[PDB]
């Protein structure tokens, strides 16, 4: 199955009049990884496409062309990939490259065919994909987790003992607009601290909840997030959230 | 100086249409302790009065009578006091009792005169007072910080490692309606986690500390950003939980009809 919903952009004044149901609908993607399905979100906040691909029996491919007014998906877009599930693979125009857990992959503009596959049907791969518009072609690059930018951050007094892993960084590679990273908070910490998209996952306990704040620096609102859910953070909003236990998340930037 | 403002009670459906500015105005007391002033809040949530008394050179007394339809402040009310500032004292109908830091005191119905003083003007006492209506007179009782019912709670995995001190508890004493306590969170913990309560957050770790206090029904929930030495009212229909950027302390007070 396949599903991509369209979500519009709003002003800070517009979200003042949203009840908790309206606010969740406009900013929260509630389902990302369903076995065998592709679930994407198109937000007019900088026209980013994000979601999850979890292959089971048949391999999946983002067959988008008429929907975006182009001949193929990445004709005018770049793509960032992070695998949060079991071992899998990605096939770029015939080239097959193995992607284990926590492995990343950047795919440049112009690449026409990208097919996602998993190694085990019962333990499928969970590809978190993000796509932004692109005007220039940059070379494709595999980002193995072994050689990933590991930079420890935060202390215990501030509830932010974390480790940030920069996959697609402007210092390590050149990109049109997309930047992607992966931050894990250690137990005892839950705080994380101009368009951004946060996808929370790897909750410590099954009853964990992450409270994500959005809005102007003082006229703030919040959204309650459960495991494997994402929130769009427009440029006019603050980037901060806090959890009941520790967690992990994948961020993506553009603008 | 003296000041008491009045705040009404609302329904869950009523605050659903509040922006963040109105929500602060109806539920958040932004200033509590000012040197030489008495700052109080009268909330129609069970008609509780709370605030701060901070004596400097001249002693302070909550002179209320006509405003409450009574002859004196405590004619039909009980009063609980916890000092969070410097060393001071309270004079109860002539009798003076010294109150050090974190010392508490319950004053029963019928007590006619309660005068607040501090020992040093440059390091004054900060008396956080809570008053609820009372129909029966119970004996006055000083609550030294040493002899307070303390029970630690929470672990580190849930970021709520705290120790709660019960001052006015139904197991240790008899009161009409008021129950009051003091909770300090360990460094590296920030989470607070059926009745009406009033929380007053203070002793912020950093000058840049913020406490986000959640209120509303378990599904339609909102939050209020608290700075140091500010208070929020929890109506009976609302949830009681808050989270801070660092660790902090707060004083809670309950009323209604429970134990």
Q: How far apart are CA A25 and CA A32, in angstroms?
A: 14
Measured CA to CA, the distance from residue A244 to residue B192 in angstroms comes to 11
Residue among B51, B44, B38, B47 nearest B7 (CA): B44
Cβ of B129: how many Cβ atoms within 10 Å? 23
The resolution, in Å, is: 3.1
Q: Return d(Cα A161, Cα A163) in angstroms, integer.
A: 7
Instruction: Please say whether the beta carbons of B78 and B108 come within 8 A.
Output: yes
Give the span between the Cα atoms of B46 and A16, in whole angstroms. Answer: 30
- With vertex at residue B124, the alpha carbon angle to CA B253 and CA B242, rounded to the nearest 5 degrees, is 30
- The residue among B218, B239, B243 with the most chain A CBs within 10 A of its CB, best to mutate, is B243
Distance, in Å, from the CA atom of B61 to the CA atom of B1, rounded to the nearest integer, reads 10
Say how many C-beta atoms besides its own lie within 10 A of residue A112's C-beta.
Answer: 11
Q: What value does the CA radius of gyration of chain A take, rounded to a whole number of Å?
A: 18
Residue in the structure block whose two tokens are 């009523």: B14
- Dihedral angle, C-alpha B30, B35, B36, B37, nearest 10 °: 0
Burial class (CB in 10 A: 0-12, 13-18, 19+), B199: buried
DSSP B59-97: -EE---SGGGTSSSTTSSEEEEEEE-SSSEEEEETTEEE
Best residue in A186, A242, A245, A247 for a mutation probing chain B (most B CBs within 10 Å): A242
Phi, psi of A14, deg, nearest 5: -75, -35
How many CA atoms, within 13 angstroms, populate the side-chain half-sphere of residue B183? 26
User: H or E stretch including B40?
Assistant: strand B38-43
Q: Give the full edge-to-edge strand order of the sheet including B221-226.
A: B221-226, B211-216, B241-244
Supply the DSSP string of chain A, one letter for each residue: -EEEEEE----TTTGGG--HHHHHHHHEE-----TT-EEEEEETTTTEEEEEE--SSS-EE---STTTTSSSGGGSEEEEEEE-SSSEEEEETTEEEEE-TT-EEEE-TT---EEEEES-SSS---EEEEEEE-SS----EEE-STT-EEEEE--TTTT--EEEEEEE-TTTS--SS-EEEEEEEPTT--EE--EEEEEEE--SSTT--EEEEEESSSSEEEEEE-SSEEEEE-TTS--EEEESS--EEEEEEE-
Written as six digits, the tokens of A66 are 């008429």
Q: Taking CB atoms and an 8 Å cutoff, what residues of chain B touch A188?
A: 156-157, 159, 188
Q: How far apart are CA B140 and CA B138, in angstroms?
A: 7
Contacts of A191 in chain B (CB under 8 A): 245
- Give the nearest chain A residue to B189 (CA atoms): A159
Contacts of A13 (CB under 8 A, 6+ apart): none
Strand order in the sheet with B127-133: B2-7, B38-43, B48-53, B127-133, B77-83, B104-107, B141-143
User: How close, in Å, is residue A201 to chain B by CA atoms?
Assistant: 17
**Cβ contact B10:B235 at 8 Å:** yes
- Per DSSP bridges, beta strands A38-43 and A2-7 are parallel
The residue among B144, B99, B138 whose CA lies nearest residue B117 is B99
How many A×B Cβ pairs under 8 Å? Answer: 59
B124 and B55 in contact (C-beta within 8 Å)? yes
Scanning A112-151 for CB atoms below 8 A from B yields none
User: For residue A79, which phi and psi values (nearest 5 degrees)?
Assistant: -140, 135
- Give yes or no for a contact between A242 and A159, defined as CB atoms under 8 angstroms apart: yes
Check if the beta carbon of residue A198 is closer than 8 Å to that of residue B205.
no
E strand spans, B188-240: 196-202, 211-216, 221-226, 230-234
Looking at the complex, does the CB of residue B13 fall below 8 Å from at least one CB of chain A? no
Structure-block tokens of residue A19: 């009840």
Q: CA separation (Å) from B82 to B89, B123, B167, B240?
A: 11, 16, 9, 21
Residue with tokens 């500010």: B230
Instruction: Write phi, then psi, for B83 (nearest 5 degrees).
Output: -95, 120
Cα–Cα nearest to B134, from B79, B76, B81, B173: B76
Q: What are phi and psi of A75, to 5 degrees?
A: -65, -35
Q: Does B191 touch chain A (CB under 8 A)?
A: yes
Dihedral of CA atoms A182, A183, A187, A192 in degrees, nearest 10, equals -140
- Provide the b/e sequence for B18-31 (b: ≥16 CB within 10 Å): bebeebbeebbbee
Residue of B nearest to A156 (CA): B188
The domain ranges of chain A are 1-255
User: Is B243 near chain A, with CB under 8 Å?
Assistant: yes
Question: Which residue is associated with the tokens 């975006």?
Answer: A68
């Amino acid at each position: 199955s396949f599903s991509m919903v369209t979500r519009y952009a709003h002003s800070p004044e517009d979200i003042q009049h949203y009840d908790t149901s309206k606010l969740r609908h406009e900013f929260l993607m509630e389902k990302i990884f369903n076995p065998g399905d592709i679930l994407l979100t198109y937000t007019y906040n900088d026209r980013m496409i994000f979601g999850g691909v979890m292959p089971t029996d048949e391999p999946l491919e983002i067959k988008l062309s008429t929907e975006l007014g182009v001949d193929f998906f990445l004709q005018r877009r770049e793509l960032g990939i992070i695998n949060i599930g079991g071992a899998g693979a990605i096939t770029i125009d015939g080239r097959k490259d193995a992607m284990s857990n926590q492995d990343g992959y950047y795919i440049g503009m112009g690449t026409q065919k990208v097919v996602f596959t998993s190694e085990d049907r019962d333990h499928p791969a969970k590809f978190y994909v993000v796509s932004t518009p692109a005007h220039k072609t940059y070379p494709n690059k595999k980002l193995p987790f072994a050689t990933a930018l590991a930079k420890p951050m935060g202390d215990q007094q501030h509830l932010n003992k974390r480790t940030i892993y920069k996959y697609i960084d402007a210092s390590q590679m050149d990109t049109c607009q997309l930047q992607m990273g992966y931050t894990v908070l250690e137990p005892g910490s839950s705080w994380n601290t101009r368009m951004e998209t946060y996808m929370y996952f790897n909750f410590a306990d099954p009853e964990t909840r992450v409270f994500h704040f959005l809005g102007k620096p003082d006229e703030t609102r919040h959204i309650t997030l459960f495991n494997e859910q994402a929130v769009v953070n427009p440029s006019w909003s603050i980037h901060c959230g806090v959890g009941t236990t520790n967690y992990a998340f994948i961020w993506a930037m553009c603008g």
